Each structure stands twice: as C-alpha cells, then as structure tokens.
Amino acid sequence: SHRKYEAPRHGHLGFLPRKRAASIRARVKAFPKDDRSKPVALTSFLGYKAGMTTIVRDLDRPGSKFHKREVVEAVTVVDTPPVVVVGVVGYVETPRGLRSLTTVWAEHLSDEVKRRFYKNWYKSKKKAFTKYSAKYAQDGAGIERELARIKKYASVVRVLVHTQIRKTPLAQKKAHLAEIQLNGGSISEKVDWAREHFEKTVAVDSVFEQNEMIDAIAVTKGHGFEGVTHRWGTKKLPRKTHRGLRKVACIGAWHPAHVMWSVARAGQRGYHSRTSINHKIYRVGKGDDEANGATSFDRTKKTITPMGGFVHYGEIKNDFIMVKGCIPGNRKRIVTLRKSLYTNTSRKALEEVSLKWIDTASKFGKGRFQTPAEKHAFMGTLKKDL
C-alpha cells in the first residue's frame, strides 16, 4: 500500500549523524580557492560570539520594496581581538590526499598557547617548547631547513594562529589554536610572509572588512538528549495516546525487517558542527575607538557594549565583527569566520551597509536606555543622590 498523502521528509539526511561535534572549535573543511596572482592573505579568522543586538540600516537596495527606507535588522557581535601567528604547516599533494609535511613554530610562544598543550597547566613545569626554542639558538639552521623544505615541496601553506583570549571577558585562559590557510602569492612568498609574522599579531581588519560576506563555522548550542518531536519536528500524536504522544508512531513496514537509518529517532540535539555561509559584515569595529556603537545618524558617542555588558559575556574592549543575522554557536563560543568560498553574484554581496543606529540598550531585561547617562537624565535624581 502506497503512502496515502505525500509529505516531505522531516529533517535533513545530509546532516547526519546528529552526534556531538568532536571538538568545541568547529573545523574548516574547505578554504577559498587559492589564486597565486593576488597578494598573501589569511582565509579565515578566530573570534568569540559575544551576543546579538538590533540595527537600523539605511537600506540602499534598488529594485526592492524597502529601497531608500530604514529597516531594522538583528545582528551578531563577534568579539575579535587580534590573533597572533605562531607557526607554519606545509602540505604536499599526494595520491592519498593532502599531507602535513612539516611544522615550524615561533621562537617565543605565549602562556595562552602553552596552556592549550596541557590538561593540568598549574601542576606542570610548563616545559612546552623548551627543546624547540634552542633550534633558534644555533643560528636557526633547523628552522631554516624546514622552511626551505616547505618552499621546495609544499603546495598548500597554512599558518598557525591563536587568540589572545586574555583580552576577552572569558574566564578561560587556554587559548584557541588553529590552522588558517594562506591564499595569494607563491609558496615562497607565503613562507616568507609567515616567517616575518611569527610573533606579530593579525588584526581582524587585516582579514575581513565591512560589506563583505563571510562564512561562520561554529559548533552549535547543545541541548542534550532530545526527542523526535523537536529533534526532527515530527507531529505530536493525539492526546493521551497509549505509550505517549511525543514520539513517532510507526517505525517500519513488514520489510526490510529493520528500522531504517531514515526513521527519526530520539537522541542528542545540538552541539553539532555547522557551516553557515554568506553573513554580511555590518561593522568591523576598532577596540581603541570609542563610539564603536555610534554612527553618522546617531551621535551619542557610545560603544557597542550594551548597558550591563552582554549577558553571559562581558564588555567589548576589542576589535569586533558585527554580522547580519544569527550565527551557529552560542555566546562565549569560539567561532571561525571564513572568507567566502566563491565570488558571490548576488546584489547583496555588493551593497554598502549604512547603519543608522546600534541598539546598546540592556539585554538583561526590557532595556529602554542606550547609555547610563541617558538613564540618569530620564530618571532624574534618586535618593542615593541628595
């Protein structure tokens, strides 16, 4: 007997298995196609999702119905202090895939990275790179040998960066280390650039800039063991159905005498690695610049930090990336921002973004004021004041 009423599948079979991601920092499984004619650039970056806020945007979208009209948008603020290069990895192209050929590290590595190499940093002697710094002492003969080897053999060069996590409000002191592929320039140019950078930082505006579409790659928010009714959106069974109503009713036919992989079953929801693409950058802020959250239509001279800070995340004292819309992963979470893998041909990817206003009201309630000064001037003097 055929299915009486045709209905589409609940859920996606290409996002399986819906298991917990193997790491909190989601991997980048593809980097933009290397074009050696362009100069050397980093193809991704690392920041922390701070939270969300509201933007009024003066929309210039010709042919639209909101053309020349202010539109209120939700945006995501990613706290992005500069990441600092600490190493190179050279990849050779083999008949079984890419292969890490060698890895050359900086002479001096901070505590933030060294913490990443221990489970028990406080107990340790902190011996992380003590026999490796000596390779720089002997005029750097080994270091130069492996860099020449990368020059000779590597067809993909990836730099190793890491976040200055102490600059964030996070309580975590163990920095986040990653491989960022270098695009542009020849192999020798890539290696020379990276060698020149082995302790210098890279600001976020040296990778991304405003009005650019970027990809957000992060492990989503975790929800634990969650049932079919909301892990897959299966309809609830009728009221007080025996054995329960929040579950899928029939599982199989007389054949294949098994439960198929396609049948929706309960299990872990969330904490999955996801790659969400084409997030328009609405603002690349600067840490030293006060009036981050001010625009040319709003002269209040305020930073993007809401009153009371973000919720479950402190202030934004650093450079930040504000992207249109929501991002995989919750607040406090390491996210990897990637350059777009293709030259997007939508007219959205071309638009210049013209903010009118950033909502810096409090996210810890029904916040009605943008600054403590404004709150004070609206309240008046209190009894704490005479």
Partner: protein, 77 residues
C-alpha cells in the same frame, strides 16, 4: 522553476562574476592587503621602541623497524 544546478542560470551567474563582482572582490582584497601591511609596519615600529635531525632520524628508523618487525608495512613487506 530553474534549479540551482541549472546550466542556464549558472551561465548567467558566470558572465556576471567576471564583471562588477570579481572587480569588487579583488579591490576589497587589495584594501585588506594594504591594511595588513599597515598592521605589520605598526608592529615592527613598536618593536623598535625596544633527515631532519637526530630526533626525527631515530624516530623514523625505529618506526620503520617496528613495522618491518611486526609485518605491518603499507609500502614494504
């Protein structure tokens, strides 16, 4: 109607790529490259305000002898 994998719409996209879109991509990239050069210059400017080895040789020789001695070699017997 026309799918994502549609040859017609993909070809219109490909004609459009080489025009204003790749121009804007390459110009954006040039600007970001200049910002990176500014950043490195500033950092060096504040800077002025102040086999492979025997380890790898023994490592590889031992690994290959263990694989030849346990008969677990992909490449040799």
């Amino acid at each position: 109607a026309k799918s994502l994998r549609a040859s017609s719409h993909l070809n219109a996209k490909s004609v459009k790529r080489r025009g204003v879109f790749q121009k804007a991509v390459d110009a954006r990239e040039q600007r970001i490259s200049d910002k990176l050069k500014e950043d490195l210059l500033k950092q060096k400017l504040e800077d002025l305000k102040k086999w492979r080895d025997g380890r790898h040789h023994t490592y590889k020789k031992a690994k290959l002898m263990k694989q030849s001695k346990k008969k677990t070699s992909f490449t040799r017997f």
